[PDB]
Amino acid sequence: VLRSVNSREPSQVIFCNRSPRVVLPVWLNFDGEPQPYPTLPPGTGRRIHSYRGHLWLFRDAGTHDGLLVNQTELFVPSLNVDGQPIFANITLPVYTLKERCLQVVRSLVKPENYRRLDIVRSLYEDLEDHPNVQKDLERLTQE
Amino acid sequence: MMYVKLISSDGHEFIVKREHALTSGTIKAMLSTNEVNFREIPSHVLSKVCMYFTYKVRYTNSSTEIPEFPIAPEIALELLMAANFLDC
Amino acid sequence: MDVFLMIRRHKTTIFTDAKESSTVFELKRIVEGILKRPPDEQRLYKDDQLLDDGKTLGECGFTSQTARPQAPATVGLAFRDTFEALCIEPFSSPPELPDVMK
Ligand SMILES: Cc1ncsc1-c1ccc(CNC(=O)[C@@H]2C[C@@H](O)CN2C(=O)[C@@H](NC(=O)C2(F)CC2)C(C)(C)SC[C@H]2CC[C@@H](CN3CCOCC3)CC2)cc1
């Protein structure tokens, strides 16, 4: 269900990274398969050529933590008005404290050593449940 | 506004807005005196939890660009355990 | 522009926000509603420097850069015929990093 539409109608977009992360843009192709695009460093913007009805999501390039674009999960280019580009402002979500702690711990501990940490077993499983695009697409489809 | 007192294991008293504290479903249940004691959370963790409450209320549903919530490596594991318990 | 503070005395820490343009005096009014002590019984400090009631918080050095929600700025408080000495007890010390986190 979540797939780009082959509109063939050009739409110019500014991918504007307003996050502290290196951002990976992800394009959902016409079969709903996610395709990675070039990364954007923190504090950078790029004018890119996309199409109306196309679907994009944004993630941390190294960790795949999910990011927000114009305050939501999915970005769909629309029609350009006045020759103005559509802005896609990529930002951090407000992560839960638990998820942010999981991010930092994963950043420090190799997955093979998660089970060495002195914490309850359910948190081993939470640490091992790394963020990933495919699961979020399934969550979004069901919504 | 209404304030609650959250007390760490080492006896530090943290006075925060109730609306901020209710970010944690655990704390809401513990409140429902106006004081909550955490026998397992020391102040170098609970102070950071209160900063998170402030951070969440300020930036949730905000269009300003959102800064990262910072967490030093030396507190990360205990803060994870507190966050798991507090459900926030 | 809002500023975000920890108002600290002894082993008490108050988390609150205020305007950069609001005054030290208006902040003591905040403290009064919470701690039930009058402004004339309060002394507020930035680091070791006592702060004048007329001065704005920004003037004292509390700004968006220094007083953020994630990293709040600390305002020292001393209560009183003699005002006590400013004393803020530090937070506890984190343990040593687990080896798998090194
Ligand atoms: C610099 C930068 N920084 C962060 S992103 C970014 C960037 C960089 C290049 C662009 C060019 N723009 C698109 O590729 C827009 C985007 C999306 O809308 C799909 N797409 C199309 O062009 C689709 N084509 C069609 O739909 C039609 F032709 C109308 C029928 C396709 C994908 C079916 S064919 C396009 C061809 C040529 C371009 C490569 C793009 N390679 C691959 C990824 O690595 C480098 C770039 C892919 C195959 C855009 C953004």
The DSSP-derived string for A95-126 is --HHHHHHHHHHHHS-GGGGGGSSS-HHHHHH
Query: A93 and A71 in contact (C-beta within 8 Å)?
Result: no
Distance (Å, whole) CA A108 – CA B73: 8
CATH 1.10.750.10 holds for A97-141: yes
As to burial, measured by CB atoms within 10 angstroms (0-12 exposed, 13-18 middle, 19+ buried), residue C72 is buried
Closest CA to A40 of A58, A24, A56: A24
- The single-letter DSSP state of residue B22 is T
- The single-letter DSSP state of residue A75 is B
Q: Which residues of A15-45 are buried (b: 16+ CB within 10 A; e: fewer)?
A: bbbbbebbbbbbebeeeeebeebebbeeeee
In chain A, which ranges are continuous DSSP H helix?
97-108, 121-128, 133-142
The Cβ of residue A121 has, within 10 Å, a number of other Cβ atoms equal to: 8
Reduced to 3 states, what is the DSSP secondary structure of residue A15? strand
Pairing of strands B3-7, B35-37: parallel
Q: Does C101 touch chain A (CB under 8 A)?
A: yes
> What is the experimental method?
X-ray
- What CATH number is attached to the domain comprising B86? 3.30.710.10
**CA-to-CA dists, residue A124 to A38, A94, A119, C22, C100, angstroms:** 32, 23, 8, 47, 14
Write down the domain spans for chain A: 10-91, 97-141
C60 Cα to chain B: minimum distance (Å): 22
Distance (Å, whole) CA A101 – CA A98: 5
Helices (H) and strands (E) counted in chain A, each on its own, are: 3, 7
Structure tokens belonging to residue C16: 């609150």
Ligand 1 atom closest to residue A77's alpha carbon, by position in its atom list? 18
As to burial, measured by CB atoms within 10 angstroms (0-12 exposed, 13-18 middle, 19+ buried), residue A99 is middle
Domain that holds residue B76: 2-88
Domain C2-101 fold is Ubiquitin-like (UB roll) (3.10.20)
Give the residue numbers in B contacting C (CB under 8 Å), as ranges. 3, 8, 10-17, 20, 42-44, 47, 50-55, 57-59, 67-70, 72-78
Query: B4 and B48 in contact (C-beta within 8 Å)?
Result: no
Distance (Å, whole) CA C18 – CA C64: 11
Give the CATH architecture of domain A10-91: Sandwich (2.60)
Write down the domain spans for chain C: 2-101
Distance (Å, whole) CA A100 – CA C66: 22
- The number of folded domains in chain B is 1
* Cβ distance of C91 and B47 shorter than 8 Å: yes
Q: Does C85 touch chain A (CB under 8 A)?
A: no
Helix (H) or strand (E) holding B28: helix B25-31
Distance (Å, whole) CA A93 – CA B69: 11
